[PDB]
Amino acid sequence: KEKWGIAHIYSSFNNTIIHITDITGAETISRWSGGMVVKADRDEPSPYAAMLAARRAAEEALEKGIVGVHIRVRAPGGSKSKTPGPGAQAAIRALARAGLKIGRVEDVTPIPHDGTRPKGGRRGRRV
Amino acid sequence: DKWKLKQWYIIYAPDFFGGVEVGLTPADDPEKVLNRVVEVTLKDVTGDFTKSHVKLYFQVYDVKGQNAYTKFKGMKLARSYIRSLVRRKTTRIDGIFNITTKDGYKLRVMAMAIAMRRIQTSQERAIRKIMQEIIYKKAEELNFKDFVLESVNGKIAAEIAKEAKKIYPLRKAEIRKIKVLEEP
Amino acid sequence: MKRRPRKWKKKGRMRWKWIKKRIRRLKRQRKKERG
Amino acid sequence: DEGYPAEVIEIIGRTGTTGDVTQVKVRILEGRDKGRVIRRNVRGPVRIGDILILRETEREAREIKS
RNA sequence: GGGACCGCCAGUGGCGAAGGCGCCCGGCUGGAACGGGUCCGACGGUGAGCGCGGAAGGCCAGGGGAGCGAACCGGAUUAGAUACCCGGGUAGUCCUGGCUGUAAAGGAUGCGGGCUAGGUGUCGGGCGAGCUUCGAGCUCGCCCGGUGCCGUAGGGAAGCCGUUAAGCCCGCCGCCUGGGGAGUACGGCCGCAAGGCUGAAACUUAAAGGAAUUGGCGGGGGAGCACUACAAGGGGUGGAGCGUGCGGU
């Protein structure tokens, strides 16, 4: 019987994190972030950092009996950004070409019906 | 290497779903498998691709060695499906109810209706009262498992649409989410 | 504090808000000088 | 030097912040993704049929948003 | 377990005197439009003084405090940073009782009536036709009320307005008489205080100010160019001694 995993993908604009878990989602089978692979902080949310860490986690999973995967793309949500970071689809191709059988790929962004007040004050961040 | 202490355990569906094989889960101890949620699409169980968007969270509650049997916790539709169903110039109508079943189960059932156009909120209130009456009637009539199957199959949605057509034609009626509040 | 919106126009002027704040500060000081 | 040869089949257009780059479409001839069509950046002039050598089949170029 | 909050639908949408008001259900209650050959009989418009209401913020007494966040404490930037940026964070934001009574409280348009081309969208109601899966469920047309746009005549300094008038009449109130001094000084009243309302003069000044055209400019946008711009590629200066000119001695 083939094995299927859950690939949480939290892609922020400052970093990207890929977290592989069992079908229950309660067991941490592989977990690699951008800081693992790059040396510059500005390089963390780069597509290269996402995809190579994704491939490393994918080979770890392949070593550990997982063949298929479902992807849970997560955004910051809440009062923060809703758009997944740039590394989302790049990492998706990374697992697809890493030899895993890609299953359902779904957004899991926590979207409030109406949540707390965001950061930035009333005028926002006046950068 | 902690991973080498882990051992696999077969999971299984609810009996009213035939207890089909949904998958395996690795764990160090049988106890930790208790009270574990697994989300599974309906295409996995019934084999129907037309009902892929439907999803069932089953709580793992029983462990016999390597074989894990699960309880039904909740039902939810796909967010992409719901979002596609929602559109501008069409009225979303939510009906959220607490229900006590014939066999004593407590169920929080929330359902959607989307019409052809923008409609007066009095008609929305009337339609709310309508499927509230229908769902209460079926909850009284049906036990837990049978009501679960009818809710998933959409027969409740079909009846709701057919009745509410007297108030306004409905683009679609659906049962968005169901939660198992308490068992008897 | 009967206001004149003409003063809001910053052309050849400060921002009226801070002028009002300054006059309030001076008035507080003066009234305290009288006791 | 495990490089993947590939053959250009279409030229998307002159790209780059100075126009010295060109965005082209290239079909992989040798490698794990043989036959797959991929958009690539090219430095220097290019004609149809130039066998390019790729160091990474995965890499793709962002579309030229006019 | 906690306190805040109720997206998408959501609308040029509805309601409310205004401030303002968006989860469902149950109750109470205000107002409006529609249909009305149903009742009363001019009972009306405006409103000094008066009274009520009144966003945010602040104040008094209690409770609560998730997030945010004046003040403040650190980090960074910068010539310097009491900032913009980042990490923490008091009051406050929330419930109760009360006070303060202010705003670009703007439709920058006080309110009631009569009249002056139309077209067009939507909302609520009513009426007539046609369709209908027979549900005013759907299509179209007419009337009324509110709510948008195009706009004739006309108006205005123009912007723009234009049956929802900034057009022509009728009527009541309030406010203004160059700029600043100044919404200050003094005085009075309210207020726990903050402050609120009322409100000068001396002196100074020949403009301030509103609309729009042409230019120029924009660390605004758009297209085309440029080997006195760059890109790709070569050469070569700035070092050395000398020729020559320049500033200075």
Curated annotation (Swiss-Prot), chain A:
Subunit (UniProt): Part of the 30S ribosomal subunit.
Residues of the region (Disordered) are 106-127
Example of a GO MF term: rRNA binding
Which NCBIfam families does this UniProt record tie to the protein? arch_S11P (TIGR03628), PRK09607.1 (NF007176)
A cellular component annotation (GO) from this entry: ribosome
Indicate the family of this protein. Answer: Belongs to the universal ribosomal protein uS11 family.
User: HAMAP family, from UniProt?
Assistant: Ribosomal_uS11 (MF_01310)
**What exactly does this protein do?**
Located on the platform of the 30S subunit.
**What is the official name of this protein in its record?**
Small ribosomal subunit protein uS11
Q: Which InterPro entries match?
A: Ribosomal_uS11, Ribosomal_uS11_archaeal, Ribosomal_uS11_CS, Ribosomal_uS11_sf
Q: Which UniProt keywords apply?
A: Ribonucleoprotein, Ribosomal protein, RNA-binding, rRNA-binding
**Might you name a Gene Ontology BP term for this protein?**
translation
UniProtKB/Swiss-Prot annotation, chain B:
Which keywords accompany this UniProt record? Ribonucleoprotein, Ribosomal protein
Task: List the InterPro entries.
Answer: Ribosomal_eS1 (IPR001593), Ribosomal_eS1_arc (IPR030838), Ribosomal_eS1_CS (IPR018281)
A single Gene Ontology CC term: ribonucleoprotein complex
UniProt entry tagged with the keyword Transcription: no
- Give the transmembrane ranges: none
Single Gene Ontology BP annotation: translation
Q: Supply one GO molecular-function term.
A: structural constituent of ribosome
**Quaternary organization:** Part of the 30S ribosomal subunit.
| Similarity section | Belongs to the eukaryotic ribosomal protein eS1 family.
- What protein does this entry describe? Small ribosomal subunit protein eS1
The organism of origin for this protein: Pyrococcus furiosus (strain ATCC 43587 / DSM 3638 / JCM 8422 / Vc1)
UniProtKB/Swiss-Prot annotation, chain C:
Q: Which domain of life is it from?
A: Archaea
How does this protein assemble? Part of the small ribosomal subunit.
Keyword Ribonucleoprotein included in the entry's annotation: yes
GO cellular component: a single term: ribonucleoprotein complex
Give the record's keywords alphabetically: Ribonucleoprotein, Ribosomal protein
**The species this protein was found in:** Pyrococcus furiosus (strain ATCC 43587 / DSM 3638 / JCM 8422 / Vc1)
What protein is this chain from? Small ribosomal subunit protein eS32
Q: What other note does the entry give for this protein?
A: Initially thought to be part of the large ribosomal subunit. Crystal structures show eS32/eL41 to be a small ribosomal subunit forming a bridge at the interface of the 2 subunits.
Q: Which family does it belong to?
A: Belongs to the eukaryotic ribosomal protein eS32 family.
From Swiss-Prot, chain D:
* Entry similarity comment: Belongs to the eukaryotic ribosomal protein eS28 family.
Top-rank taxon of the source lineage equals Archaea
Q: From the UniProt record, report the name of the gene that encodes this protein.
A: rps28e
Query: What species was this sequence derived from?
Result: Pyrococcus furiosus (strain ATCC 43587 / DSM 3638 / JCM 8422 / Vc1)
Q: Does the keyword Cell cycle apply?
A: no
InterPro entries for the chain = NA-bd_OB-fold (IPR012340), Ribosomal_eS28 (IPR000289), Ribosomal_eS28_CS (IPR028626)
**Phosphoprotein: is it a keyword of this entry?**
no
Pfam families hit by this protein: Ribosomal_S28e
UniProt keywords (A-Z) are: Ribonucleoprotein, Ribosomal protein
What this protein is called in its record is Small ribosomal subunit protein eS28
Tell me the GO BP annotations in alphabetical order.
Answer: maturation of SSU-rRNA; ribosomal small subunit assembly; translation
MF-aspect GO terms: structural constituent of ribosome
Quaternary structure, from the entry: Part of the 30S ribosomal subunit.
